[PDB]
Structure 1
Amino acid sequence: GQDRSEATLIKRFKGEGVRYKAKLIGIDEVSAARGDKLCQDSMMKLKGVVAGARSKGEHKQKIFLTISFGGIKIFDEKTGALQHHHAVHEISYIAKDITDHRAFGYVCGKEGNHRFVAIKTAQAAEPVILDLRDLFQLIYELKQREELEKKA
């Protein structure tokens, strides 16, 4: 039970935002901006690729992802370097992995350039998904009140 009041959420997502330890499953090109089946099919495909690489001795990249007013950022764990950056306006859909409580993904990109990014979280994926929901809702609300800049 975490506090999700507006004031708390602003302090939560400002600056570097919230960080989560995870592993990158992969990135797949998709045909649309949203869709439950679209995402589950992509997640299943990417995991299949990872499983095939895992049989060859390959492991997923260790990362940490942050959720902030800057959107979703993926950093390499070993070096701390920023590897992927998807702005809030570029993210269209968030989806939990129906078969894995520790995996989720999101669709990003403009029309005709959609990609599904799959993440295996160190702990439960739920808190990450809820943070994204809260972040997007907050930005929508602040924008409607013309106060996003005063809180970002």
Structure 2
Amino acid sequence: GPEKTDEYLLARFKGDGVKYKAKLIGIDDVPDARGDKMSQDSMMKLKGMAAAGRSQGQHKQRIWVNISLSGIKIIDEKTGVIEHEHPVNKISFIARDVTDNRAFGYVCGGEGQHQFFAIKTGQQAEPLVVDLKDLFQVIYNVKKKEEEKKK
């Protein structure tokens, strides 16, 4: 299909952007802004915790993951309340889960406050992961083109 352009991505993510059905596996404090191994260790811990909770009749919270030029919003599906919101410049790393095509996570937070948000997607995680890659790329592209033209 047609290759992406900056303008296509700007229109896709402006305003309310796009949203995906998911469940929140958990949130974990982590030591660094980025890293595959750090993220997977966090994913495994949070999945272990969710499995223990499941054995006690707990369920993961049903959410929308909203992706836009404003960053990522975690929205409670039942009530529609925004439970978590991180702007683009406070999201540091996107992690895939090699064990699970329906999970991914992201590291976010300012310095000394890095946290891993682990997400179980309703469908495959890859389209969401790619949307995040594209979101960050178009914002970076637009910034760089502005900088090159002013110099």
Matching of residues 111-150 of structure 1 within 5 Å: 111-146=111-146
Q: Aligned pair 1:41/2:37, yes or no?
A: no
- Asked whether 1:27 is paired with 2:23, we answer no
Alignment of structure 1 residues 3-82 onto 2, 5 Å: 3-82=3-82
CA-to-partner distance for each residue in 1:17-60, whole Å, 9 max, x for gaps?
Answer: 01000000000000001111100000000000000000000000
How big is the shift at 1:3?
A: 4.6
Unaligned runs of 5+ in 1: 148-152
| Structure-1 residue corresponding to 2:109 | 109
Deviations 1:40-90 (Å, cap 9, x if unpaired)?
Answer: 000000000000000000000000011100000000000111110011000
TM-score normalised by L of structure 2: 0.94
- The RMSD of aligned alpha carbons is 1.2
Residue 72 of structure 1: SS of its match in structure 2?
A: strand
- Structure 2 counterpart of 1:83, one-letter code: E
> Do the aligned partners of 2:28 and 2:115 also contact (CA within 8 Å) in 1?
yes
Q: Please name the residue that 1:84 is paired with.
A: 84
* CA drift at 1:2: 6.5
Match of 1:150 in 2: none
| TM superposition shift of 1:144 | 1.5
Question: Is the CA contact (8 Å cut-off) linking 2:6 and 2:141 kept in structure 1?
Answer: no
Task: Give the superposition deviation at 1:4.
Answer: 2.0
Unpaired runs of at least 5, structure 2: none
Q: CA deviation at 1:16?
A: 0.4
Partners of 1:33 and 1:104 in 2: CA distance: 16
Within 1, Cα distance between the matches of 2:56 and 2:127?
A: 32
Q: How far apart, in 2, do the equivalents of 1:34 and 1:118 lie?
A: 14
Runs of at least 4 residues of structure 1 off by over 3 A?
none
SS at 2:146 equivalent? coil
Take 1:138 and 1:100, find their aligned partners in 2: how far apart are those partners? 27
Residue aligned with 1:146, SS: helix
How many pairs are equivalent?
A: 147
